[PDB]
């Protein structure tokens, strides 16, 4: 994944991860379901409703994506009207 670049000696990031996933500052990664816009004419409304969901990733997948991205994508952002602003923090979680 180019741990060391030939120009700066820096770690690089896989841009497919950035194009496909969103990282909340707590450490959670959000993805879209596969096939959520393919052949909707053979799918039931419940299946399509569960396909339209934004879902969380595994612990293993989260660590893999953290390895595949650089620390720039893990900083705390303060956008103006972020629809995911309230999801960047964890509440009432115990160990």
């Amino acid at each position: 994944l180019t741990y060391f670049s030939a120009r700066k000696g820096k770690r690089k990031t896989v841009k497919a991860v950035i194009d496909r996933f969103l990282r909340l500052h707590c450490g959670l990664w959000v993805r879209r379901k596969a096939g959520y816009k393919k052949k909707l004419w053979k799918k039931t409304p419940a299946r399509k409703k569960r396909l339209r969901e934004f879902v969380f990733c595994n612990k293993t997948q989260s660590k893999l994506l953290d390895k595949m991205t650089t620390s720039f994508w893990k900083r705390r952002n303060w956008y103006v009207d972020d629809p995911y602003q309230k999801y960047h923090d964890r509440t009432n979680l115990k160990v």
Binding site: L1, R20, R75, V80
Partner: protein
């Protein structure tokens, strides 16, 4: 202390007596010996022991997880979105109470940074400070503050104690200049004129409800009265105040600093200020 009394004995400290704190220096593990050699932690043959293991994200040939998922514009224009550092009312009250930024003078971005209540990053796309209502109650400050964004509850809370809040705009260059003025002064450049807000921020900063710095002051009292009526706590008249002159300082647009004007040059050594006559320069720096 008993420690120096102990040291009164205890032969003198030299370079032959030094020793690290236990736990700081973890011991290195070398591949020599029976336990750590003969395979050196690599296991038996295959790609593992030979080091030619496939790249991270590869899953043996099956379509990987990070490619199976459909693309979605989560971080589409992330480098162009604007960001604002939150400044809470309770943090502002704490700053005021601890001898930091002084309410007796207008409070703006440079004052907040010099008091070190906020750290603004012009790179990483921060457009200033946004005011939030975390400490709306138990907030007795009486300040004249200038921010870039503010909630209506924060506006009500500040206006409620006899203070004035206004909402201004800064382009990234003026943001850097106003956050770190001293490096700009050492740069040697004449003070530029602050730029107007973008076409989408124009209706925000020309709206008297957000206390925008480009809105007509003929609608400020009615909006202040409306906020006071919505939230109780009748609106105080600040014209009869002893600090009304200080509260009135408004810091004209295209003027990044208070007493300074665009086009001036600051000479920090041999302290003085240079003014650009040849009135073509005046026309450029005023228009």
């Amino acid at each position: 202390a008993r420690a120096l009394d102990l040291l009164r004995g205890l032969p003198r400290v030299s370079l032959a007596n030094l020793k690290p704190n236990p736990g700081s220096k973890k011991p290195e593990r070398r591949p020599r010996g029976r336990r750590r050699g003969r395979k050196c932690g690599r296991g038996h043959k295959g790609e593992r022991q030979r080091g030619t293991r496939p790249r991270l994200g590869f899953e043996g040939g099956q379509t990987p997880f990070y490619i199976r998922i459909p693309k979605y514009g989560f971080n589409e224009g992330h480098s162009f979105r604007r960001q604002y550092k939150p400044l809470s009312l309770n943090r502002l009250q704490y700053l005021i109470d601890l001898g930091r930024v002084d309410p007796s003078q207008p409070i703006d971005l440079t004052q907040l940074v010099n008091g070190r209540g906020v750290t603004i990053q012009p790179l990483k796309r921060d457009y200033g400070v946004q005011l939030v209502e975390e400490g709306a109650d138990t907030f007795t400050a009486k300040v004249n503050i200038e921010v870039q964004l503010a909630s209506e509850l924060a506006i009500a809370a500040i206006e409620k104690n006899g203070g004035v809040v206004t909402t201004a705009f800064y382009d990234p260059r003026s943001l850097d200049i106003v956050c770190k003025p001293v490096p700009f002064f050492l740069r040697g450049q004449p003070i530029p004129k602050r730029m107007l807000p973008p076409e989408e921020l124009v209706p925000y900063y020309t709206d008297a409800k957000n206390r925008g710095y480009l809105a007509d002051p003929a609608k400020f009292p009615e909006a202040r009265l409306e906020l006071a009526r919505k939230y109780g706590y009748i609106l105080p008249d600040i014209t009869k105040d002893e600090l009304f002159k200080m509260l009135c300082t408004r810091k004209d647009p295209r003027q990044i600093f208070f007493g300074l004007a665009p086009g001036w040059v600051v000479n920090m050594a041999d302290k003085k200020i240079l003014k650009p006559t040849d009135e073509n320069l005046l026309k450029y720096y005023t228009s």
